[PDB]
Amino acid sequence: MLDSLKSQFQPSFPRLASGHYVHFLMLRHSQSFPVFQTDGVLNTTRTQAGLLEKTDQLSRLVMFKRKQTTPERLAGRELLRNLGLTSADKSAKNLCEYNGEGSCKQCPDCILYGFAIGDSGSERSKVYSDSAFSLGAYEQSHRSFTFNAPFEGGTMSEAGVMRSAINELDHILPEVTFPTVESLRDATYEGFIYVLGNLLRTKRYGAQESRTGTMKNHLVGIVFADGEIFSNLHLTQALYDQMGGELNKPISELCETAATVAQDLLNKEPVRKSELIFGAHLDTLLQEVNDIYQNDAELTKLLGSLYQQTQDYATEFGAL
Partner DNA sequence: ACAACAATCAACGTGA
Partner DNA sequence: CACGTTGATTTTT
CA 90 to chain centre: 29
Applying CB under 8 A, the span of 49-57, 193-201, 256-264, 276-284 interacting with a copy of itself comes to 193-201
C-beta of 120 vs 295, nearer to a copy of itself: 295
Under the binding rule (CB under 7 A), the answer on residue 320 touching DNA is no
Q: Give the nearest distance from C-beta 233 to a copy of itself in angstroms.
A: 5
Stretch near a copy of itself under the rule CB under 8 A, chosen from 12-20, 50-58, 100-108, 213-221: 213-221
Cα–Cα distance for residue pair 258/252, rounded to 1 Å: 10
Euclidean distance between CA atoms 315 and 307, whole angstroms = 12
Q: According to CB under 8 A, which residues from 170 to 189 bind a copy of itself?
A: 174
> Does residue 267 bind DNA (CB under 7 A)?
no
Options 4-12, 114-122, 198-206, 255-263: segment touching another protein (CB under 8 A): 114-122
Nearer to another protein, 143 or 301 (CB): 143
* End-to-end CA, the chain: 35
Q: How far apart are CA 178 and CA 262, in angstroms?
A: 14
Phi, psi (deg, nearest 5) at residue 24: -95, 120
Report d(CA 130, CA 150) in Å as an integer. 41
| Residue 108, phi then psi, degrees to nearest 5 | -55, -40
Q: Does residue 109 belong to the site contacting a copy of itself (CB under 8 A)?
A: no
* Burial 200-228, CB ≥16 within 10 A → b, else e: bbbebbbbeeeebbebebbbbbbbbbeeb
Region near DNA per CB under 7 A, out of 160-168, 238-246, 259-267, 284-292: 160-168
Residue 39 binding result from another protein, a copy of itself, DNA, none, given CB thresholds of 5 to 8 Å by partner type: another protein
Question: Which 3 state secondary structure label does DSSP give 141?
Answer: helix
Q: What is the CA radius of gyration of the chain?
A: 22
The only residue of 164, 248, 252, 294 in contact with DNA, by rule CB under 7 A:
164
**Residue 117 binds DNA, judged by CB under 7 A:** yes
Q: Binds 154, which of another protein, DNA, a copy of itself, none (CB < 5 to 8 A, cut-off by type)?
A: a copy of itself
The amino acid sitting at 66 is: R
Q: How far is the CB of 150 from DNA (least distance, A)?
A: 9
Cα–Cα distance, 318 to 320 (Å, whole number):
6
Sequence-distant (6+) residues with CB within 8 A of 9 are 20, 22, 187, 188, 189, 191, 192
Is residue 165 a contact residue for another protein (CB under 8 A)?
A: no
Kindly list the residues in this chain that would bind DNA in the complex (CB under 7 A). 116-119, 122, 146, 148-149, 156, 162-168
Kindly list the residues in this chain that would bind a copy of itself in the complex (CB under 8 A). 31-33, 75, 78-79, 82, 114, 124-125, 127-131, 133, 154, 174, 197, 200-204, 209-212, 214-216, 226-228, 231-234, 268-273, 289-290, 293-296, 299
